[PDB]
Predict the structure.
Amino acid sequence: ANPTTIANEVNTISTIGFSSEVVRLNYLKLQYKFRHLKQTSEKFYTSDSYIGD
Amino acid sequence: TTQLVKEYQEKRSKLEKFMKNPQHDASLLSNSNEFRDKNVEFFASGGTRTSKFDKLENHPFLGYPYKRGVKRVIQHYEPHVEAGG
């Protein structure tokens, strides 16, 4: 509220309020699966200038 | 000139009649040695008996509500107390 004038005798004064705020940040874990060739199978797929089917 | 001064005196007296403690310079001191019947005056602010835990609120006022019942009037400015019942 507006400030209170201190004149003569007074008991009711304006108040200053306070507040707290809690801030939360979330973290999520995600995953993908991908197919590939076995390590001990590349020699049977190595072409002249590339590797893979 | 003289009529203007007389009108000034009349207006000042009328205005200071509606005042809690009007400032009037006097040529002589008054005698109030007797300690009885000195409390019935317009400048006797507060109350005859007052408690330490009394609630007092200060507000802007319109008019002259001294020693009178006051009501809240909302108008821009803050609401003010005015003589009423």
Chain A touches chain B through nine residues (CB under 8 Å). Chain A has no helices and no strands. Residues 4 and 11 of chain A are 10 Å apart (CA to CA).
